[PDB]
Each structure stands twice: as structure tokens, then as C-alpha cells.
Design an enzyme around this catalytic site. Structure first.
Site, PDB file in Angstrom:
ATOM      1  CB  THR A  66      -0.904   0.043   1.229  1.00 45.55           C
ATOM      2  OG1 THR A  66      -0.083   0.080   2.408  1.00 45.55           O
ATOM      3  CG2 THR A  66      -1.812  -1.174   1.271  1.00 45.55           C
ATOM      4  CB  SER A  67       0.270   4.629  -1.345  1.00 49.09           C
ATOM      5  OG  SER A  67       0.531   4.295  -2.694  1.00 49.09           O
ATOM      6  CG  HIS A 118       5.272  -1.102   3.299  1.00 49.36           C
ATOM      7  ND1 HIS A 118       4.244  -1.051   4.213  1.00 49.36           N
ATOM      8  CD2 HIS A 118       4.799  -0.537   2.165  1.00 49.36           C
ATOM      9  CE1 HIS A 118       3.192  -0.477   3.654  1.00 49.36           C
ATOM     10  NE2 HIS A 118       3.502  -0.161   2.410  1.00 49.36           N
ATOM     11  N   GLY A 119       8.306  -2.640   6.002  1.00 48.84           N
ATOM     12  CA  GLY A 119       9.360  -3.527   6.448  1.00 48.84           C
ATOM     13  C   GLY A 119       8.825  -4.734   7.176  1.00 48.84           C
ATOM     14  CB  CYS A 124       6.026  -3.218   9.972  1.00 48.71           C
ATOM     15  SG  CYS A 124       4.561  -2.165  10.032  1.00 48.71           S
TER      16      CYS A 124
END
Ligand code: NA
Ligand code: NA
EC number: 3.4.22.56
Lengths: 235, 4, 235, 4
Positions: C34-35, C93-94, C135
Site C-alpha cells: 500500500t501507499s 514498509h518492512g 514494521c
């Protein structure tokens, strides 16, 4: 009264708290784990160091994985309401995320979960310190969150071996006790642990007849979820 | 010197 | 001259150093990611905050995994001899140990390895700060070592999601910038980051129509291999 | 509020 600040943990409860030292030296033969020569020097140094900080020290030797879990469960169900803090020292073999009982491994998360803010209410809001001398691999060099107020003082960086001298004790515990003796009445705990990082990184280097293990260095690492400054003294 |  | 102490990093080189901000908002459709609404607020706040600390800020937006690795390799091969320190901020993100490029993941270890004391000699002995908003899973709440002098300021505890508000930015970066603005001229960096831990843990709680994600809390976590105190000012 |  006058203006009041709240940036440091309250450390003037009637008791400083418990210091549990788990000292695993001899392992069941079926595990294939070597005896950890020098670890008694570490355990004695820690007992004296934390006694002088006015912790109630309990030393445990050669615990199975089942005994480690029962001990931690039982301690987490004590009433800590009159205690400022909690300290647990683990001296054993290990891998990333794992400490060894004498007969097999224990997840570090299983141990620390007993002291979560929602599972040990008399330690909620108080610092919970886990000091871990163990390998972490084989490389050579809803008001408060339930994971808040933990500090993990690891002897070595993630993924790396940790070094123990059979005569002098482990590099990390030697250094930790020296820096606590010298600075606990002066410096905040993160600054003490930074001096431990420097002492381990600068004053130790391995000696081995095996080229794979010779001339190696170590850096400890501090994992802090603390929300306030931690001074072992109070005004 | 030994490793843990 | 008189007695001299050496417990703090030298921060009076001609330059404070680089601050690299990697701001990944939009991801390739095939990844399914997701953005990251709100991340531009974070990147602008960081650029201004580190500009006022006199870092040379470089902002990069929407980098592929290959571009992230090339950027970090190239920066690590610059001459940092006149710079006091190095700062890298990752916004993406992660998962545990992983940051996402726009087209797939990058190991955090691959990024930080470029700056090892043996692989970036003009940063040896100088603080290398990695600030990670991402994350880390899906839980809801031979003179110096080559890994020495790194600090990882993680937005969240190991294994946990990290929270970002689409209007205000991420909880961690909002708090980090506020505490740097207020205290960088007064407090040592570990003490600043402890105040960030407290601000995130006390002032934020998620709101969601989905019971699984509602009323959740966050604690950041500081991973320090530093060997000296870090003050952004000097005498 | 969103997660990363
Ligand atoms: Na050690
Ligand atoms: Na955050």
C-alpha cells in the site's frame, strides 16, 4: 510545592528489587554443550556488585530449561509493589533469541514475557533489566505498552559469538561489574553501559592457536525500551 | 579465551 | 595542558556529516504494498530537523531495492574525513530485519555493512546512526570491532507493527523530530531517544473501526553499539 | 492510523 520534573524512574521505594542470577556452567552430556569455565567468577562478581547496589540477590546454578521457566514464572508472581526495579542476569550458552538450560533451550521471549506490563502488575512502570552473557550466533568480529520499560544488556551484537575467559570470566560481565562499581553513584545507566561497550571493544582481543578464532574482537549492545533515565542512587 |  | 577527558564523540569536525533520507511512499503494483500516506510529512520534518543540526541533508524518494543498495554503496565510498558522523533515515514498509524498496526487500544488514569500521575507513570511530520507520512484523501492542559505533533507532519493538498517521506522519518520526528540536542543544542522544520512547508510549493510541487494530500502543527501541556519548553540539 |  515547587516545579517538579519526572524524567527519571522512581528508585526510592523501600527496596531496590530482586537480582536473579542464573549461572549455567555444566550441561547434560546428551546436549553436547561444553562446560563454561570462568562463569563462577562472573556470578560471584555480579552477586557482589548488585549487593552493593542494595539489590536482593538470588543465585541459581545449573538450571534445566523447565527450572528456568518455573523460576521466572514464580518470581513474576511475587508482590514487587515495594521494589523499585527488577534485574535478571543469564549466564549460559545461547543462540540468537535463545538461552540454554542445562538440558536444552529456552526462548528469551518466554522468559521476558512473564514481566510484561500487563502480566506483572507490580512491576508496571518500573525498569526491568535483563543482562545476557551468551552467544547470539557464530559470527566473529491500554495505558502503557506491554513491552515498555525493558532494557536488554546483551554481551554481544546480534548474530555473533560472545567471549568468555576461563580464568578471568566473560569480557562483558568483567567490564559491566567494573563500570557499575566505578560509576553507579555518578552516571545514568545508559551512560554506564556505553562505557562497558567501550571497555569491551578496546581492552579485549582473543588469543587462540586456531586461526579461525584468533585475534577477534567484541562489541556488546544495548537494547532499550526504557521510558525514563535510570539512576541507581536517589536524592 | 572461549566462546559461549 | 590540563587534564583531558575522552568520553564523548568528537563532533567539531568541519562538517556534521550527511543525513540521507530514503522516503518510499509508492510501491510497484506487483508487490501488493500500500501507499504510505503521511510519509511526506515525515520526510519534510526530518529534513528541517537535521538541517537545523547542520547536517548536509539528501532526500531520496521512491527508490527500488537496487537503487537503495547503489545509493548506500556510493555514499559509503565518499570521503567522510571532514565529517563528524553519518545519519541514514529509512521510511518504508518492512519486516524484521528488512526494509522495502519500491519493487522488493532489502536486508538492513546489507545496507549497514557498507559502513562497517573496516569497510568505510573515513567513518571508523565515528557515530553511524540508522533511524528506521518501518514494521518489524505483525504483532500489536584489528583495533576496533567492525560493528562498533552504530546506533539503530527503531520505531518499534522487534516483531511488532509500526504506526503511521496519514495526516500527521508516523508516531515515531513526529516524536523524534519534536524531541530533537527541543533537546538537541541540551541532552545526550540516548537521553533524547529515551524521551522519544516515552512520548510515543504515552501520547499515541490507534483508532480503528476494525477491532483487531483498534486501541493499540507502540514502544520504539534503541539499539546502541556506541562507545561514547553523543552530543550534537560542541563547546 | 495505518501500519507500515
Ligand atoms: Na563477554
Ligand atoms: Na511510528
Amino acid at each position: 510545592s515547587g516545579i517538579s520534573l519526572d524524567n527519571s524512574y522512581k528508585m526510592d521505594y523501600p527496596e531496590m528489587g530482586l537480582c536473579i542470577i542464573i549461572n549455567n556452567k555444566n550441561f547434560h552430556k546428551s546436549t553436547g554443550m561444553t562446560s563454561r569455565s570462568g562463569t563462577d567468577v562472573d556470578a560471584a562478581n555480579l552477586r557482589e556488585t548488585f549487593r552493593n547496589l542494595k539489590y536482593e540477590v538470588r543465585n541459581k546454578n545449573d538450571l534445566t530449561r523447565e527450572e528456568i521457566v518455573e523460576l521466572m514464572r514464580d518470581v513474576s508472581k511475587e508482590d514487587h509493589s515495594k521494589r523499585s526495579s527488577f534485574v535478571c542476569v543469564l549466564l549460559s550458552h545461547g543462540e540468537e533469541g535463545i538461552i540454554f538450560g542445562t538440558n536444552g533451550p529456552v526462548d528469551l521471549k518466554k522468559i521476558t514475557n512473564f514481566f510484561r506490563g500487563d502480566r506483572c502488575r507490580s512491576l508496571t512502570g518500573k525498569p526491568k533489566l535483563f543482562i545476557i552473557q551468551a552467544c547470539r550466533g557464530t559470527e566473529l568480529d491500554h495505558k502503557i505498552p506491554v513491552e515498555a520499560d525493558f532494557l536488554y544488556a546483551y554481551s554481544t551484537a546480534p548474530g555473533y559469538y560472545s567471549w568468555r575467559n576461563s580464568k578471568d570470566g566473560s569480557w562483558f560481565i568483567q567490564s559491566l561489574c567494573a563500570m557499575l562499581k566505578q560509576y553507579a553513584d555518578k552516571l545514568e545507566f545508559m551512560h554506564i553501559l556505553t562505557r562497558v561497550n567501550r571497555k569491551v571493544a578496546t581492552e579485549f582481543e582473543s588469543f587462540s592457536f586456531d586461526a579461525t578464532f584468533h585475534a577477534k574482537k567484541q562489541i556488546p549492545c544495548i537494547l532499550s525500551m526504557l521510558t525514563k533515565e535510570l539512576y541507581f542512587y536517589h536524592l | 579465551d572461549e566462546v559461549d
